Amino acid sequence: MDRPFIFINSAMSADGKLSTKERKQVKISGKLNFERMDELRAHADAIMVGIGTVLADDPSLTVKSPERKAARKAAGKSENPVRVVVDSSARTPLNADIFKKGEGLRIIAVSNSAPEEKIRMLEEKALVIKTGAFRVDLTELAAKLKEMGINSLMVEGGATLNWGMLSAGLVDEVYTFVGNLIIGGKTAPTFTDGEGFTENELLGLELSSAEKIEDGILLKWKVK
Amino acid sequence: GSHHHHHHGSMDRPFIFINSAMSADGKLSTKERKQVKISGKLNFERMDELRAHADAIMVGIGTVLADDPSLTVKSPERKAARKAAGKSENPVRVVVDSSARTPLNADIFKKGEGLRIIAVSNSAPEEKIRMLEEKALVIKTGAFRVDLTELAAKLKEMGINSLMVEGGATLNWGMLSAGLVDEVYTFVGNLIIGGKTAPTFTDGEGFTENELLGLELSSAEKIEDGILLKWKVKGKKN
Ligand SMILES: NC(=O)c1ccc[n+]([C@@H]2O[C@H](COP(=O)([O-])OP(=O)(O)OC[C@H]3O[C@@H](n4cnc5c(N)ncnc54)[C@H](OP(=O)(O)O)[C@@H]3O)[C@@H](O)[C@H]2O)c1
């Protein structure tokens, strides 16, 4: 029933895009936003992304700063928080950078439809948690993560995973770094894609703060 | 920045600004293209003040078909002041409508005084153009899509020095990708709409990495439950 505190942290263009229409990564934020993001990763118990992000960008999801890594190690944690990939069909690449870089637990959340041959390969490098039929049951995942010690879960995104989490009612707060650019594109991934809310189910927020950082602005929203 | 900031005395085109309201996730309406409550009374008053000071308001055919807006100034005081200063009660109303689909009973024709312009492409059906010419000036420009650069020149030439683009996702793209926009104002509302198919603040084709349009944040101002961001367009980041 219970779950971690859950927050989304992403960087988007002034027009709401996470990457181009080609699904390519571009420069949205500068060094100061990257330092803020590294502070969040250091204090989070776990970081989560979707399979889409893993296949597109192959991110390591590591804490970068030696001092943050040491501070975590000093308090008895792994240098990196737990790293979780949401991945229905067990397609996380075996040579993904998440497995190559750094210490810490990796968790692949898969669906019960996932092929067992792919799951066994993945289990060599990670804990595999199975939920749902053809897609991951994010509520059940969130309960299992909470059970195993995670009280703080940072969702860094994916346009579709952000939708999954917000529409399941699992999210406490939304952090959006808004960068000084227009990306454009009907098919460019946005801060929240997926199915979308109809007019009678819009998710209300409350603006907690707005802080200029370098050339953009960090908006923090509490979810209602 | 590389972008040359136009003003009311620039000879090629009007000063051009986009004013929209979007969700926290960048959407202008639902996946069903349904208009929802993004902003409140205070942003609506700011919006109405801006309309009053524009020479012309431009919207896409998609907005006309979805929302059937009048694009009128609402405050009787604003309208009176425009009239007292020798202007039309409402700014000029312009619809970007490649195939001449603007409905003959659209609200822009039923409500208020002033000039109406429908900008159409040369592929628009001749008979549809002729029927709209009963109710408006029709400007034919572009082969299969409206040429927005040429349209802006034509507007300047008629004496329009300030052009408010209320937008629509696709028109916002047309204007920004042609490098026609001086400033971008987005009221960011306190909601998530979501949806891969929901119209965003800028749709269309989209920029590649080498075409990204740079901005400069002029201001951020909290208003009721949301936040107004104003951006100066700085030009291509290359
Ligand atoms: N600027 C930024 O801050 C930032 C951060 C991260 C990513 N991005 C960008 O966003 C894009 C990737 O986003 P994306 O939407 O393609 O992928 P994504 O959100 O990373 O992952 C979504 C995928 O997760 C899987 N999933 C499994 N169970 C799910 C559930 N219950 N709800 C939702 N998803 C579930 C689904 O695929 P299966 O069903 O096949 O498992 C789904 O298509 C990339 O272009 C990346 O660069 C940007």
Ligand SMILES: NC(=O)c1ccc[n+]([C@@H]2O[C@H](COP(=O)([O-])OP(=O)(O)OC[C@H]3O[C@@H](n4cnc5c(N)ncnc54)[C@H](OP(=O)(O)O)[C@@H]3O)[C@@H](O)[C@H]2O)c1
């Ligand atoms: N929240 C807000 O402040 C706000 C403001 C405005 C609109 N909206 C919402 O936006 C939603 C949908 O937007 P939309 O993109 O469908 O409508 P739109 O941008 O108002 O209309 C776009 C249309 O303009 C026409 N066009 C012709 N030549 C063009 C050119 N060179 N460049 C760009 N466009 C050209 C195209 O259709 P043809 O080629 O067929 O003529 C195009 O589909 C609506 O549901 C509305 O509620 C919200």
